[model samples]
Target: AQYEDGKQYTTLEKPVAGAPQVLEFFSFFCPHCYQFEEVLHISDNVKKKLPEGVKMTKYHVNFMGGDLGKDLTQAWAVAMALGVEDKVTVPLFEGVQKTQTIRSASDIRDVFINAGIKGEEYDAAWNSFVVKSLVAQQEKAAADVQLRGVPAMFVNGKYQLNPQGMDTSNMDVFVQQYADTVKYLSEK
Candidate 1:
């Protein structure tokens, strides 16, 4: 079913048909998702083991929705829109979690700057149309999913609540299994 009108879904605007889609129901501030980043980035073989057609997309859940929710969503959307998502997500997360990590908002914004966004341009883009749209959409999505916590996932349209029920500890299994589920569904 489609998202109910005015209700939000963890939204990704990427065009996905060319690749079997992998959508991580992650949060920008999620510790586990950041920890999994090492695995995701290090294991290209594991990544390649997935059906050749899959393309992964990131859904930055507004885990702490409200005014603060909108703020984080804006940063995520800005990073993506400016074509610096690769530099932003992990670095920003590490900055938040690592005591010694120097990466922070300035570090993340530098990613935008390096990607050709500059100065007030970067500031403006953080609040630009695409970021704003995603922020608004995220607000809707948070309400719609009624998500209980960060790092939850869905495969295609199916919510991976767990073999038993919704929780976070099994996400690695869920993501791996969900990849197979996508392959199986697409071949049908």
Candidate 2:
């Protein structure tokens, strides 16, 4: 479909009052999400072009938990806890997808260490009480929303942009569409 309705973009019953919340639900282990990050240049495009009064965040999904999924989710929370998410997110995704070396929490720590983070800093973030709470929050949020897949976006906690509605022919098309939609909704 060229355009999606409320069905494609699921809406929450209650909307938050402040700025619209734009969330990208993803998993580091998901190859499509990795490609979406690279192809869409998600960090730059979404954050840069986001309309005024809009807040953007990327939530790591943990539904596929075994070892890798669980570990990466915790790693993401750790990055956020240490205030290194903007620094480590893309590289972490690339490191895992390109090198296929990050398989556990220890491997994720190594990735951070190689990126110049001190062992002490990494240890603190990895074992932080804040990180544990954040990880659990992320898991609960995803489950609350019943997120079905990675690379999906939700706006204002009320509207979910179905990934299947995106135009696969050009990555920019989908990014622009989502941005435009969010901006329009925020204005409303």
Candidate 3:
């Protein structure tokens, strides 16, 4: 099975969007996602290999921790809306899981303030249509896939990655293979 449908990937019942994009439906509550993002830096690295004009978008799936999970989703979308995902991902992950430092939406805003982002800035983005839209889009995406877990990825809206189909015998090879999968799928 060479990236075979249903073996290496699941074909979406419908496309996520008309544009070329890779959507990562993830949650802040998963340790696997933390390692993938912060330790192996897979998300950061994979985007580097993405072909030009292909954008990788991260969407927070909010079914993990009840109401807190939903708030985290908003926090994630707000950071992306403000162009600060890089600055907040690790903190959000660590704060929520490791230290219980971020307990609510207000705590999330506090982290942003600590990072020198004004309270008003965080509030504006948090309330903005862009952030809310991103959150809603991901909610629909989660239902679209009937997703059962965290850290799922869809390339160009249709090809949902099959982790079982990817080689993980070695970190470098795994990342390269995964990146190539996205590269190939995004082009189609």
Report backbone clashes per prediction: 5, 0, 0
Q: What tens digits encode model 3's per-residue C-alpha lDDT throughout 1-188?
A: 46677765778787666633777877788887887787677787778888777677778877898898999888888887788888888888888888888887788788888877888889888889988888887787777767889778887667888777877789787777777777777777
Sort every candidate by lDDT, greatest first: 3, 2, 1
Best by TM-score: 3
Off by over 4 Å in 3: 13-20
| lDDT of model 2, residue 92 | 80
lDDT of 3 at 126: 84
Every candidate's lDDT: 0.53, 0.73, 0.80
What does candidate 2's lDDT look like per residue over 1-188, in tens digits?
43456634656675444422776778887888877777776655666766676667777987654688888888889888777876787778877788877767777888888878899988887788898998987886777667777877777667766556556687788777666665554454
The candidate that achieves the highest lDDT relative to the unseen native structure = 3
TM value for model 3? 0.87
- Candidate 2 residue spans exceeding 4 A from truth: 1-8, 12-20
- For residues 70-105, write the lDDT of model 1, one tens digit per residue: 456677777767777776665566555664343345
**What is the RMSD, in Å, between candidate 3 and the native fold over all Cα?**
2.1
Poorest lDDT segment (10 consecutive residues) of candidate 1: 1-10
